[PDB]
């Protein structure tokens, strides 16, 4: 298995369609012996620039260990959800411990 961070932004006018994706793909990772080390809300931040009429956004931090083809099949799952703005997949750095 491989380790990844995954830290994503939620679109404030599509936001109700995210839990039906992420709380339902936790089975698709753990069915492959993978792990999700937090999936914690990082709250509504004001942005350093307006992303074309978007200036305040909600953040979530995942922390994951999985097969690489299950994170590739999660990328198409984030893209087909469209309420999420970048998955921000980043390699290695090992698993999080003691709540960071």
């Amino acid at each position: 298995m491989r380790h990844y961070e995954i830290v994503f932004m939620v679109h404030p006018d599509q936001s109700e369609q995210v839990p039906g994706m992420i709380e339902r793909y936790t089975a698709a990772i753990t069915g492959a012996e993978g792990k999700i080390h937090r999936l914690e809300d990082w709250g509504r931040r004001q942005l350093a620039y307006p992303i074309n009429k978007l200036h305040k956004a909600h953040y979530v931090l995942m922390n994951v260990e999985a097969p690489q083809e299950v994170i590739d099949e999660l990328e198409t799952t984030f893209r087909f959800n469209d309420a999420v703005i970048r998955s921000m997949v980043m390699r290695t750095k090992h698993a999080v411990t003691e709540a960071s």
């Binding site: 932004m9 931040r45 350093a48 620039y49 921000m88």
Partner: protein, 55 residues
């Protein structure tokens, strides 16, 4: 190091114009200057730092 989700210490290595501070004013070792310089750019893609600096 390993994190760019917080910036309150990372901003110490950025100019008021948003560009990276030269290591010779901070005494920072060149391997860590390179890491901090790329970490400052990584934090722009999480929208925690601007790209401009036009007004």
């Amino acid at each position: 190091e390993i994190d760019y989700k917080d910036i309150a210490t990372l901003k110490n290595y950025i100019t008021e114009s948003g560009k990276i501070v030269p290591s010779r004013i901070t005494g920072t070792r060149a391997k860590y200057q390179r890491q901090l310089a790329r970490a400052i750019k990584r934090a722009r893609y999480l929208s925690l730092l601007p790209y401009t600096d036009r007004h």
